[PDB]
Amino acid sequence: LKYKNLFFDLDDTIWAFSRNARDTFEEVYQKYSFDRYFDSFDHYYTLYQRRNTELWLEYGEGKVTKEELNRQRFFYPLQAVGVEDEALAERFSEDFFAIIPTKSGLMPHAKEVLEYLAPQYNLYILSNGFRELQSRKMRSAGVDRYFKKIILSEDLGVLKPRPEIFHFALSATQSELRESLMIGDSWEADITGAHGVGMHQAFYNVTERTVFPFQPTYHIHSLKELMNLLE
């Protein structure tokens, strides 16, 4: 086999982050009777997402700390509707973090695909997500067992797509570059990052992307395609 090491992103590649996070935010929204402050959950969540997206970029650029990232992203939607209650935002975030890692939703066919690949490849996670969440998410969903090691941006202090985290992931796992494949849903973090260091990439397209500044090594629309690609 050409590849010996498969590096998977976690969120929206293996774990159903968008689905699981929407469910969790809605549960916490309802718990705190947020219809008092917003027209609907979607009024809340669209505001939350707009700022959260901006914030994760600032974080990757070293413009906010993880702590400031978290403080701002749960407070932003409340202050956007005139609620200046920072303590309420903090209680909300505590409940979000208590619940999110308990969710078990995976991307389609993930368990089957991982069970198929595990005997034949070293399987790794390469993720920017929080150490106190990532392995818990994986256990809850029953997929932690497939992965030999989890490599986090927090291990190094550098987020995808910066090159350092990819070179670190290779060394940390005794992996040769030419024997490694990055599999992920983020064009900007996973595919651009891996391409940047000369590592092959399989772009898992769940955003209906049609425009490519460069072509990924492989372009798949289902994790099932991995079983065919890497048979």
Residues making contact with Mg ion (CB under 5 A): 9, 11-13, 185-186
Q: Is 155 marked within a binding site?
A: no
Cis peptide before 213 (omega within 30 of 0): no
Instruction: Report strand pairing: 122-127 vs 149-152.
Output: parallel
Buried b (16+ CB within 10 A) or exposed e, 68-104: ebbbbbbbbbbebeebeeeebbeebbebbbebbbebe
Stretch that binds Cl ion, among 25-33, 53-61, 144-152, 169-177 (CB under 5 A): 144-152
Find the binder of Cl ion among 144, 154, 164, 225 (CB under 5 A): 144
Find the binder of Cl ion among 70, 122, 127, 134 (CB under 5 A): 127
Region for residue 199 given its phi and psi (left: phi exceeds 0; alpha: psi -120 to 50; beta: otherwise): beta
Pick what 153 binds: Mg ion, Cl ion, none; C-beta below 5 to 8 Å, kind-dependent: none
The answer to the question of residue 128 lying near Cl ion (CB under 5 A) is yes
Stretch that binds Cl ion, among 12-20, 32-40, 77-85, 140-148 (CB under 5 A): 140-148
Q: Is 11 marked within a binding site?
A: yes
Burial of 8 (0-12, 13-18, 19+ CB in 10 A): buried
Q: Is 185 marked within a binding site?
A: yes
Residue that the structure tokens 């809605």 belong to: 26
- The size of the interface with Cl ion (CB under 5 A), counted in residues, is 6
CB of 163 to Cl ion, least distance (A): 16
The answer to the question of residue 148 lying near Cl ion (CB under 5 A) is no
Q: Among residues 114 and 170, whose Cβ is nearest to Cl ion?
A: 114
Q: Give the list of residues 6+ apart from residue 123 with CB closer than 8 angstroms, or none.
A: 6, 8, 114, 117, 146, 147, 148
Binding site for Cl ion (CB under 5 A): 127-128, 139, 142, 144-145
Enumerate the known binding-site residues for Mg(2+).
9, 11, 185
